[PDB]
Amino acid sequence: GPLGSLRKEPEIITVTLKKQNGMGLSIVAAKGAGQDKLGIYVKSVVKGGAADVDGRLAAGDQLLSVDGRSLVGLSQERAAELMTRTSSVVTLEVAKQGAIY
């Protein structure tokens, strides 16, 4: 598949270990259980990591796929298990919604 570079649109995004101190990011998935909703979201950067300081992701980015795993819309229990081991770069797929405020 193709890949861009940087733009404020729904796409593949990739986040290198620029300063090696882990990624330092924050995500939340949902499921089709207790509420009807499903999905994944970048809740924040963690204000202290390599993918935080040089990836500078936005609060609210609706995540869909994960490094080594093209999920296209499935919950973190089969994806954050891969992302945590990354050691060098997360590829991701996201869609800009919400803001900091």
Q: Which residues bind ligand STF (CB under 6 A)?
A: 22-27, 42, 46, 49, 80, 83-84, 86, 90
Q: How far is the CB of 27 from ligand STF (least distance, A)?
A: 4
Q: How far is the CB of 40 from ligand STF (least distance, A)?
A: 8
3-class secondary-structure state, position 89: strand
Q: Name the closest residue to ligand STF (Cβ).
A: 25
* Adjacent-strand bridge partners of 41: 28
Cβ proximity to ligand STF, 36 vs 47, nearer residue: 47
Cβ proximity to ligand STF, 4 vs 48, nearer residue: 48
Task: For 17-83, give the DSSP string.
Answer: -TTSS---EEEEEE-SSSSS--EEEEEEE-SSSHHHHHH-PPTTB---EETTB--SS--GGGTHHHH
Cβ proximity to ligand STF, 8 vs 47, nearer residue: 47
Q: How far apart are CA 4 and CA 25, in angstroms?
A: 22
Q: How far is the CB of 25 from ligand STF (least distance, A)?
A: 3
